[PDB]
Design an enzyme around this catalytic site. Structure first.
Site, PDB file in Angstrom:
ATOM      1  N   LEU A  42     -93.337  -2.610   6.030  1.00 53.79           N
ATOM      2  CA  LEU A  42     -93.363  -1.362   5.278  1.00 53.79           C
ATOM      3  C   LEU A  42     -92.136  -0.511   5.589  1.00 53.79           C
ATOM      4  CD1 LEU A  42     -97.140  -0.437   5.639  1.00 53.79           C
ATOM      5  CD2 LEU A  42     -95.991  -1.987   4.040  1.00 53.79           C
ATOM      6  N   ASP A  43     -91.609   0.144   4.558  1.00 58.43           N
ATOM      7  CA  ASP A  43     -90.496   1.066   4.722  1.00 58.43           C
ATOM      8  C   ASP A  43     -91.022   2.495   4.854  1.00 58.43           C
ATOM      9  OD1 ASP A  43     -91.112   0.938   1.802  1.00 58.43           O
ATOM     10  OD2 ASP A  43     -89.481   2.403   1.704  1.00 58.43           O
TER      11      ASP A  43
END
Lengths: 119, 12, 168, 128, 603, 178, 85, 108, 153, 459
Positions: G39-40
């Site tokens: 995830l960013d």
């Protein structure tokens, strides 16, 4: 609301003025007009403590309705016929007032017609 | 699961 | 025990009950229940208290003040006569206030009693109060916080001089 | 190009719509760090006194004392009769008094005139 | 007649007993709320008796029990006017308070000071009864100010909330601005009619002048949240939901309309005051309905509906139809109280969530609340043969069939349509659709208190209008004959509003995003009246206080004028006199000068 | 529980805050979940489009324009969580919160009603009174010569030492005191 | 609504598992979104928003950015809601 | 994300906070100091109901009716009632009667 | 004591000393204009309501959103959360003023227009018996009223 | 009147010869008994005053004020006990002696039958009040406040002394009864105008008039609790009593000369009520509210109508009680937190619940919630002014609104919100403080039931 349409958008002179009504005298036209007859006596209205607004030409039916309501209690659905009688009398009076409005309309148009006759 | 209620002294 | 003449009440005309329906009237039974539960105990309690009052009956009297010379007959700086006359004037001021109060009470009771016909059937009481209010205003109005017999006398003299000028 | 937000005195400009929040320089960041330094020192002093198990009583905030003094005591010592001060004082002190005098005097004089001419209704005005 | 006075007084006195017993141990015990509720229920049962007596024989009375003080020619005494208005409103208000207290027991169970809450509610009921049953303007003022103060206390029930305190202060401020008119009316009546009793005021003032009626109108606008003083009622929702439903929904807000109704005989004479009342009612109805249309908080929506209904009642007063206004007060009490209670139930189920956007799919989750809300909304929108039909339908028909300001009539019809609109808004967003509330589902309406409290008001909403309308004596000449379109105008407008609101609400489903319109901003922002009016005057008044009165005058200019300048002159003269030179040569010359000057001046 | 603020907000943090504000206001406008999801995916795509812009000037101008768009498109009545600032229930229970020091002023009879609790309270008081000196020493040692340049406070370095300035955070009134 | 610690952990893992981008099998209490998962930042923002919607309480942005872990979210929720078990 | 010092500090505070919360939990004993009313089974069904009825309604009604006896007689005009409406019907005191013309046309 | 507010700073050293006294940066510190209004040394802080301050930050005094040792705005009592609020609004202030005042003016103007053209029904004046209830409406009984006669249509 | 005077004088030897432990107890007990004796004076013949002797008389105006003073003395002792505990026995006895001398002087002022004796006793009150303020004040500004109070009052009074001596020379007597009975009207001449100014201005100073009120805030803020109580409750009311008494002499010129003071008071009430909105000190706010209410009283006196006079008397009594109670409530918070800043102590309702109720009742009375005697007086004054001019309602209504706003703002700020975290010295309210607040409140609420007692002679 259409009578307002004629009164405002159209010629004001032809249409009756509600405050001014009735400008024309009762004698004009209507060769014989009987006085409106009030069945209820003034003392009867005062004794029954009828409201001044309700002390109208239909007061007798209202007196009968109040007496029927007082006697019928507890039952509060037993005066439908007397209520209908009073309502019908009020309806007749309202129709009479509408007829007065129509009379004023036609009389004003006739007056305008006389002024037209001059020219 | 009763929890102590912190309130000011009401005795006085 | 109030005097009827001082506090007039028109004779009571109460329509007789004229039922026209079979259904039982709730008000009648509720009123009988009230009489039994409340009115009878209250009446018995008042009977007991009135018996107790009758056992030791004592009387109180209404004081009578003899009329005293007015300010008009009091010489200048005559503080004794001025004091007596001013006290009399103040008592009369209170009495006239009470008279106006009585008439106003008649007015309000008539407004309530007549009902929707108050405007016509209360005219006599309104006329009585109009007369009383005009008299009271002329006699005592505008005297001020430090009202005195001398100032009321001066106002009356001013009014009388104005009336003479109106006579021309 | 949505309509822009005209800031006013009772509608401050949102920081998001602040033209300066997007033109930052090294000096501005340095100043921000210094301001955080000041705040951190003040918070350290406060929390040290606030968590002291021996302290019993108020933690006298010099800022509050300064605010109260400036709002009460320091006013007259740092006041100089000036054109603005003198004119504003005249207007807001004596101006309203003469306006209310004009109003009440005119009303009262009219009432007295009507009373003299017998042209005022006090039929039931018997309680002044 | 003899039982009438005793029962009417006992109904009021019984309520005070719980207040007296607040000093006793029952206040400490859990039984106090139930005791207060039972006292209210017994008071309602007793109140029914005098109402039945009036229905039978119109046994109106005035009771001056105690003589407070006689001020020269003015006698002030405690007098209760047990007329049609009081004898009917007392039972309605008592019934509503009974239901509201039963609901509060469930809603306020967690609150530590529940006994205080119930005691404050009983105090408000007592003050409102004082307001209704008053034959003197002073006693009516006692009730007026008591209601204002109790609203201030209850609205800010959570003292922690700064918003709640601001709302309480706002309510006090607007109501006091209204009370200026009440004071004006009292002064005028005492000075001119020499009395504060309603009876003498009516008797003497055959043709009432304008000033006292305008003051009464200002007071009524303050109490009933008319335009210009309207903001306080919506902000009052910061208080607990029972407080809103009882006072700021159905009972307290009606006071101003009740104040104008009480002075109806004087109101008839003056045409200008009637026109102003009608116009203010139209403004209130249109503005409040429009604001409610775009509101996303259920309590806010209901409060704006209450304000609009108050505006409609004021319009009825303007049309010179007061008794219909009183009837509308009575019916609005029922259905609006039920609506606010249903909103409270939804809020409690959804963990203090009041935004409609986060409420959905509750039609089946909460069957009884859904039924109560459906019935209440139908009654509010004038569904035939419900409580609303007997009041609002007649109000509209009378407005059409009378000499009226054209814009007022147009605004009232549009307001009725907007009422249908916002009822549809609440129903569609909350009960209809799919659930939007947080995952953990705690919906549980199965509480005997909630169900029974809503049940009583549901039965009242369904059937009370018929019973009251049939039993009450006829007090206005009916508008017997009228054009069919005129007769059906109310239903036509309500149905059109329903259709348009339903169409627009369905469009929300469509996956289209459009930036808000300016009109939507105007409605949602409450017309900008709060933003600008609560900031510009407040800022100027407080800043003027500090900058001018506190500093420029008190701390600077007055001090400079009288004290500082005199002290400075004295100090300079002292420095002059005490030259501190002490040389014989210098002051002996002054002796020579003095001798010469004395010889010249004084011979 | 709030973390100490930083002197400035980084560009990434500002973008993240704008993203959160835009999503919440969109949810306010998009009442129904499906429409919200569709337009929210649209917004995520919008951010991704310029996610990787190399020029910082261009990214800053983009952020500025996005903020202007947000102000135009903000919901007039955005949804506020009930207990959040501006929420209906914000600070509702503040009055019920009562400070711990109040218990010390209880009458001895009142303290008798809850004996075990006050014994435990005495234990906690002893812990604080002992820990204060070491906490002050640690704060002095870690503090830089100029002074504390951030609000962050050090954790306990050694066993038997409580975190410096721990009393009020640990003993803060319960969220729902009742 | 006791809202015990285990309930908070279970609900947070529920929300995360219903998150398509996160593969359910490797999701763990200590799985940092930035490092362990892929995830960013915007995914961090979305997950924080999802948690605040699930529990109905708003996590301030300054605190929200620093979670970076499910267990961190659980403990922060426990601190905010005063869950001691 | 958390700095290591921030994580350690927050975890220590978590432990201390949870310990404080558990300490705030009440024990099984909450000593209440220990019968002014000797009515142990007071019929909860009806005794309370009738007692409440008497005390709250019956006593005040008695007192108010007695006060009506006091105030009505002591002072004139204290209680004034709107004159009862009189229709064409009999009156109790004088047994008078009248009819309303009835000349009204019956059909409607 | 030097901590107490003092006169308006004129020399730069006085400005630095005032900034130190008020716990502000020298650049940030700006005195009120020296116009004799009594402000003197006190800082002229930005005119922002306490509502504008970040709610989430752990302020020393939570209700007032204020910190110990922070310079306190001269008008803090005016700008407290209960009292005036200057927080930015969704719409521009000028637009709100224009819209609200225009709405009020238009409403009043339309009410005047309605008064000019008042709605009514096509009916004649209501007729009342006994000379329009002259006696019932309070007319003088002794003075015979001018007769008012209503005839059947 | 010696039934009250002689025991008050004997209070001093008892206090001086009492044991160190028992000074407060004896003083309170015997002062309360004296107050009980004073209640006999309330029985007033409607027509005439109670002329006890040549020197002393009582009427329906003096009686309530005498009762108020006798009541105030014990409350003052109860309030002053706390902060004088550390003081030595001799100083405590001297403080009590100053209070007792003040009561004796006030009683003789209210009952005095001669204007010159009234002047001597009315000015004599300055010495004990000045000593109290400047010796037992807690701030460096107590001396400046004492100077302002003394010099404002003396500058007002001395021309009054000259005018009274001139009246004695011309009319021949300064006895109030003779003056009232003879009371020749004044003429509109510059000399009579200045005589009117000389008579009025001293009482105008005593009753804080806008432009002459500067002494009141300093003195009330800087004085000890007892001194503030006397200044608010009674010392201000001396001006109203004298102005009502003195107005008999100046009958006609009062209409012409009233306008400046009438306008000043009417606008100043608004100005001071607005000042209260933005005050940062609780005592100062209370003082400015006192100023506004006394402005209402001044308007009532200047209008010179019976209803206005009744309202003036009722307002004087009600305000004395309410302002004294407010000062005591503020003093409790000051003792606990040792500051008068309103913001410093917040959320006290949670910490001290019952004191919150005391504050609520005091504020409600301050904002004139009916049927409070405050409202009765204010309403009567408002009606009298409405008769004077219908336009007066605007200013009076605005003042009512501003009074409600500032009273409830004080209540909200001090007693509501979150508690100030750092303050840890708040302790359970003592029975003494609650008893003082109850002794303040209960007589005020009770007086509503029988309001003829405080409605004055014109009733």
């Amino acid at each position: 609301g259409a009578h307002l349409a004629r009164r405002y958008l159209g010629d004001a002179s032809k249409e009756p003025d509600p405050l001014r009504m009735p400008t024309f005298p009762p004698d004009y036209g209507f060769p014989e007009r009987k006085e409106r007859e009030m069945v209820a006596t003034q003392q009867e209205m005062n004794d029954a403590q009828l409201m001044l607004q309700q002390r109208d030409y239909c007061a007798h039916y209202l007196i009968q309705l109040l007496k029927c309501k007082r006697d019928s209690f507890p039952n509060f659905l037993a005066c439908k016929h007397e209520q209908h009688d009073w309502d019908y009398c009020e309806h007749l009076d309202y129709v009479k007032r509408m007829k007065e409005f129509e009379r004023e309309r036609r009389l004003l148009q006739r007056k305008k017609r006389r002024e037209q006759r001059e020219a | 699961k009763r929890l102590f209620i912190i309130k000011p002294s009401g005795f006085y | 025990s109030w005097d009827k003449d001082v506090y007039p009440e028109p004779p009571r005309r109460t329509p007789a009950p004229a039922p026209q329906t079979s259904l039982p009237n709730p008000v009648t039974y509720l009123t009988k229940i009230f009489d039994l539960l409340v009115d009878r105990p209250v009446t018995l309690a008042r009977e007991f208290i009135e018996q107790q009052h009758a056992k030791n009956r004592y009387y109180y009297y209404h004081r009578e003040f003899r009329r005293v010379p007015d300010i008009t007959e009091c010489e200048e700086k005559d503080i004794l006569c001025m004091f007596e006359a001013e006290m009399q004037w103040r008592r009369d001021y209170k009495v006239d206030q009470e008279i106006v109060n009585i008439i106003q009470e008649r007015l309000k009771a008539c407004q309530q009693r007549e009902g929707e016909s108050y405007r016509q059937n209360c005219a006599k009481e309104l006329e009585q109060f109009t007369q009383v209010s005009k008299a009271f205003q002329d006699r005592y109005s505008d005297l001020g916080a430090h009202y005195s017999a001398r100032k009321c006398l001066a106002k009356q003299k001013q009014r009388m001089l104005a009336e003479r000028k109106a006579a021309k | 190009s949505f309509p822009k937000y005209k800031p006013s005195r009772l509608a401050t400009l949102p920081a998001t719509l602040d033209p300066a929040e997007y033109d930052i320089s090294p000096e501005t960041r340095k100043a921000q760090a210094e301001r955080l330094a000041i705040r951190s020192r003040l918070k350290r002093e406060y929390l040290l006194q606030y968590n002291d198990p021996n302290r019993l009583g108020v933690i006298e905030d010099p800022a509050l004392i300064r605010w109260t003094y400036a709002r009460s005591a320091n006013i007259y010592p740092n006041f100089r009769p000036t054109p603005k001060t003198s004119l504003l004082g005249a207007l807001f002190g004596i101006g309203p008094l003469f306006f209310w005098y004009y109003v009440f005097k005119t009303d009262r004089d009219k009432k007295e005139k009507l009373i003299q001419e017998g042209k005022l209704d006090q039929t039931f005005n018997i309680s002044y | 007649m003899n039982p009438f006075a005793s029962l009417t007084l006992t109904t009021l006195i019984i309520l005070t007993i719980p207040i007296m017993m607040s000093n006793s141990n029952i206040y400490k015990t859990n039984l106090y709320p139930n005791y207060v509720k039972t006292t209210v229920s017994y008071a309602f049962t007793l109140s029914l008796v005098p109402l039945l007596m009036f229905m039978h024989t119109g046994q109106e009375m005035i009771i001056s029990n105690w003589h407070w003080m006689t001020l020269q020619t003015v006698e002030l005494s405690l007098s209760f006017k047990m007329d049609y208005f009081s004898v009917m409103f007392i039972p309605v208000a008592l019934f509503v308070t009974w239901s509201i207290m039963e609901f509060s027991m469930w809603y306020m169970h967690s609150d530590p000071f529940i006994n205080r809450f119930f005691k404050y509610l009983v105090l408000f009921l007592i003050t409102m009864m004082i307001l209704v049953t008053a034959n003197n303007l002073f006693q009516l003022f006692i009730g007026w100010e008591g209601v204002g103060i109790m609203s201030f206390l209850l609205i800010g029930w959570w003292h922690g909330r700064t918003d709640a305190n601001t709302a309480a202060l706002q309510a006090i401020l607007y109501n006091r601005i209204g009370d200026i008119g009440f004071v004006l009316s009292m002064a005028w009546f005492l000075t001119h009619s020499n009395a504060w009793d309603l009876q003498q005021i009516f008797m003497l003032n055959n043709e009432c002048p304008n000033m006292p009626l305008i003051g009464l109108l200002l007071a009524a606008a303050g109490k009933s949240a008319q335009f210009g003083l309207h903001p306080w009622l919506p902000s009052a929702m910061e208080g607990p939901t029972p407080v809103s439903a009882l006072l700021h929904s159905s009972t307290m807000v009606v006071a101003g309309v009740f104040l104008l109704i009480r002075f109806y005989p004087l109101m008839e004479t003056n045409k200008l005051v009637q026109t102003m009342t009608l116009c203010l009612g139209a403004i209130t109805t249109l503005f409040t309905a429009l604001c409610a249309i775009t509101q996303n908080d259920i309590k806010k929506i209901v409060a704006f509906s209450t304000s609009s209904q108050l505006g409609l009642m004021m319009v009825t007063i303007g049309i010179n139809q007061p008794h219909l206004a009183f009837l509308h007060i009575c019916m609005h009490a029922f259905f609006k109280a039920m609506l606010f209670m249903c909103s409270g139930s939804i809020i409690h189920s959804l963990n203090d969530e009041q935004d409609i956007r986060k409420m959905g799919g509750l039609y089946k989750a909460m069957p009884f609340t859904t039924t109560a809300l459906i019935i209440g909304s139908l009654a509010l929108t004038g569904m035939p043969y419900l409580t609303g039909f007997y009041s609002k339908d007649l109000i509209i028909e009378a407005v059409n069939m009378s000499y009226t300001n054209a814009w007022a009539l147009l605004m009232t019809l549009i307001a009725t349509s907007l009422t249908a609109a916002y009822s549809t808004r609440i129903i569609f967003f909350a009960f209809l659709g799919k659930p939007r509330f947080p995952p953990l589902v705690l919906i549980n309406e199965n509480n005997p208190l909630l169900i029974n409290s809503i049940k009583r008001l549901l039965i009242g909403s369904i059937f009370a209008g018929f019973i009251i309308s049939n039993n009450i004596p006829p007090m206005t000449v009916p508008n017997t004959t009228m054009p069919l379109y005129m007769k059906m105008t109310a239903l036509i407008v309500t149905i059109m509003g329903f259709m348009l609101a339903l169409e627009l609400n369905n469009t929300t489903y469509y996956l289209k995003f459009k930036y808000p319109s300016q009109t939507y901003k105007f409605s949602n922002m409450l017309g900008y009246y709060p933003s600008i009016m609560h900031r510009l005057p407040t800022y100027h008044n407080l800043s003027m206080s500090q900058k001018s009165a506190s500093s420029l005058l008190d701390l600077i200019w007055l001090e400079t004028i009288l004290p500082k300048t005199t002290s400075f002159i004295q100090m300079k003269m002292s420095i002059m006199v005490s030259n501190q030179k002490g040389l014989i040569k210098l002051y002996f010359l002054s002796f020579l000068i003095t001798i010469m000057i004395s010889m010249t001046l004084f011979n | 529980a709030f973390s100490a603020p930083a002197a400035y907000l980084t560009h990434q943090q500002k973008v993240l805050r704008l993203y959160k504000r835009a999503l919440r206001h969109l949810e306010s406008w998009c009442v129904h979940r499906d429409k919200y999801r569709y337009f929210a995916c649209l917004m995520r795509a919008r951010f991704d489009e310029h996610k990787n812009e190399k020029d910082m000037v261009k990214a800053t101008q983009l952020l500025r324009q996005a903020e202007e768009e947000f102000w135009y498109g903000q919901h007039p009545q955005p949804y506020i969580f009930p207990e959040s600032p501006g929420g209906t229930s914000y600070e509702r229970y503040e009055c019920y919160k009562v400070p711990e020091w109040c218990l010390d002023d209880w009458h001895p009879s009142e303290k008798a009603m809850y004996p075990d609790y006050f014994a435990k309270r005495e234990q906690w008081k002893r812990l604080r009174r002992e820990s204060w000196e070491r906490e002050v020493k640690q704060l002095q040692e870690e503090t830089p010569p100029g002074g504390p340049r951030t609000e962050a406070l050090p954790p306990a370095r050694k066993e038997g030492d409580l975190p410096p300035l721990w009393w009020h955070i640990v003993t803060r009134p319960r969220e729902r005191p009742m | 609504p006791p809202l015990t610690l285990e309930a908070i952990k279970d609900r947070v893992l529920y929300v995360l598992k219903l998150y398509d981008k996160i593969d359910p099998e490797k999701l763990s209490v200590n799985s940092h979104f930035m490092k362990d998962l892929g995830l960013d930042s915007l995914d961090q923002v979305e997950i924080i928003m999802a948690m605040e919607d699930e529990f109905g309480f708003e996590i301030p942005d300054i605190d929200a950015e620093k979670l970076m872990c499910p267990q961190e979210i659980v403990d922060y929720i426990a601190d905010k809601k005063d869950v001691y078990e | 994300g958390y700095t290591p010092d921030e994580k350690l500090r927050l975890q220590q505070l978590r432990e201390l906070r949870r310990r404080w919360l558990k300490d705030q939990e009440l024990s099984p004993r909450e000593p209440v100091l220990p019968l002014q009313d000797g009515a142990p089974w007071v019929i909860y069904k009806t005794y309370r109901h009738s007692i409440f009825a008497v005390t709250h309604v019956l006593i005040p009604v008695w007192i108010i009716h007695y006060y009506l006896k006091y105030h009505v007689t002591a002072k004139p005009y204290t209680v004034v009632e709107r004159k009862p409406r009189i229709f064409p019907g009999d009156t109790i005191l004088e047994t008078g009667e009248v009819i309303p013309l009835m000349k009204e046309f019956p059909d409607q | 004591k030097d901590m107490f507010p003092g006169p308006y700073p004129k020399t730069p050293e006085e400005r630095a000393a005032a900034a130190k006294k008020y716990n502000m940066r020298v650049e940030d510190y700006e005195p009120y204009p020296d116009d004799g209004m009594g402000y003197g040394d006190y800082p002229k802080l930005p005119d922002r309501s306490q509502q504008e301050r970040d709610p989430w930050y752990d302020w020393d005094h939570p209700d007032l959103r204020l910190n110990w040792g922070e310079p306190i705005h001269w008008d803090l009592d005016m700008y407290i959360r209960n009292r005036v609020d200057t927080s930015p609004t969704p719409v521009s202030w000028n637009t709100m003023c224009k819209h609200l005042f225009g709405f009020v003016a238009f409403m009043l103007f339309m009410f005047w227009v309605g008064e000019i053209y008042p709605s009514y029904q096509p009916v004649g004046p209501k007729q009342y018996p006994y000379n329009d209830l002259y006696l019932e409406r309070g007319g003088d009984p002794t003075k015979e009223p001018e007769p008012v006669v209503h005839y059947e249509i | 009147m010696l039934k009250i005077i002689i025991p008050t004088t004997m209070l001093l030897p008892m206090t001086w010869m009492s044991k160190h432990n028992m000074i407060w107890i004896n003083a309170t007990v015997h002062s309360l008994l004296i107050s009980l004796i004073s209640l006999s004076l309330l029985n007033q013949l409607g027509e005439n005053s109670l002329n006890f002797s040549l020197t002393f008389f009582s009427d329906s105006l003096s009686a309530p004020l005498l009762v108020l003073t006798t009541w105030l003395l014990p409350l003052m002792l109860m309030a002053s006990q706390s902060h004088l505990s550390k003081e030595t026995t001799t100083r405590k006895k001297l403080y009590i002696t100053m209070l007792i001398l003040l009561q004796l002087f006030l009683i003789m002022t209210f009952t005095a039958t001669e204007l010159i004796l009234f002047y001597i006793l009315f000015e004599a009150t300055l010495v004990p009040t000045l000593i109290i303020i400047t010796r037992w004040g807690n701030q460096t500004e107590r001396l400046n406040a004492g100077l302002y109070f003394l010099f404002y009052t003396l500058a007002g009074s001395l021309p009054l002394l000259v005018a009274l001596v001139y009246i004695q020379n011309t009319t021949g007597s300064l006895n109030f009864l003779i003056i009232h009975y003879w009371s020749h009207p004044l003429s509109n001449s510059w000399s009579n105008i200045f005589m009117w100014l000389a008579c009025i201005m001293a009482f105008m100073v005593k009753m804080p008039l806008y432009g002459l009120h500067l002494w009141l805030p300093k003195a009330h803020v800087e004085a000890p609790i007892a001194g503030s109580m006397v200044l608010a409750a009674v010392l201000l009311k001396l001006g109203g009593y004298g102005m009502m008494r003195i107005t008999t002499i100046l009958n006609p010129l009062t209409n012409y000369m009233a306008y400046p003071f009438l306008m000043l008071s009417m606008w100043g009430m608004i100005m001071t009520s607005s000042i209260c909105l933005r005050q940062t000190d609780l005592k100062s706010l209370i003082a400015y509210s006192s100023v506004s209410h006394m402005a209402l009283v001044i308007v009532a006196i200047m209008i010179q109508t019976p209803w206005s006079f009744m309202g003036a008397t009722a307002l004087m009594i009600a305000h004395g009680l309410t302002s004294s109670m407010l000062f005591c409530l503020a003093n409790t918070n000051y003792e606990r937190v040792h500051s008068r800043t309103m913001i410093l102590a917040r959320g006290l309702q949670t910490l001290l619940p019952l004191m919150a109720t005391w504050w609520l009742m005091a504020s409600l009375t301050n904002l004139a919630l009916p049927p409070s005697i405050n409202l009765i007086g204010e309403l009567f004054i408002i009606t009298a002014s409405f008769s004077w001019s219908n336009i007066t309602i605007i200013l009076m209504g605005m003042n009512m609104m501003i009074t409600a706003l500032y009273s409830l703002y004080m209540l909200i700020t001090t007693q509501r919100g979150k508690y100030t975290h750092h303050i840890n010295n708040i302790k359970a309210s003592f029975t003494r403080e609650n008893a003082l607040m109850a002794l303040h409140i209960l007589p005020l609420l009770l007086l509503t039931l029988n309001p003829k007692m405080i409605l004055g002679p014109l009733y």
